[PDB]
RNA sequence: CCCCCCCACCCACAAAAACCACAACACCCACAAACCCAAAAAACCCCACAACCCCCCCACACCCCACCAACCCCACAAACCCCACACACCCCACAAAAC
């Protein structure tokens, strides 16, 4: 529900969960990142 | 894979020993303005005709199975240590030796 997701966000203070970052990195890295793509942004932003 | 004697650091003139030293120096820094190897706009899946979307299919079929006799890349026999003449048998031995 929108309400459930919003409360989940609020509980973490509007901060990404570790699993969120892990998933984002896993998707971005195992992809041929195009120049200004969302993939490139995800790789550059969330890494090590 | 010891030796010539004397000898016996692949030591040595003096002066001396940083492969230090003109001075000025001392980022293998620096032209300014500036200081993303950004920017026209419109855009922004290296998406898209449509039908379609197994690099699926004729059918019969479907062990890259099958003639049977068969089926150890067994066998003549005699045999069967890639064993033997004796003499023998350290790839020992002149002597002197024998780092």
From TrEMBL:
<protein>
    <recommendedName>
        <fullName>Nucleoprotein</fullName>
    </recommendedName>
</protein>
<comment type="similarity">
    <text>Belongs to the lyssavirus nucleocapsid protein family.</text>
</comment>
């Amino acid at each position: 529900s929108p309400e459930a997701v919003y409360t989940r966000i609020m509980m973490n203070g509007g901060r990404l969960k570790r699993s969120h970052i892990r998933r984002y990195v896993s998707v971005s890295s195992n992809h041929q990142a195009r120049p200004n793509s969302f993939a490139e942004f995800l790789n550059k932003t969330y890494s090590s």
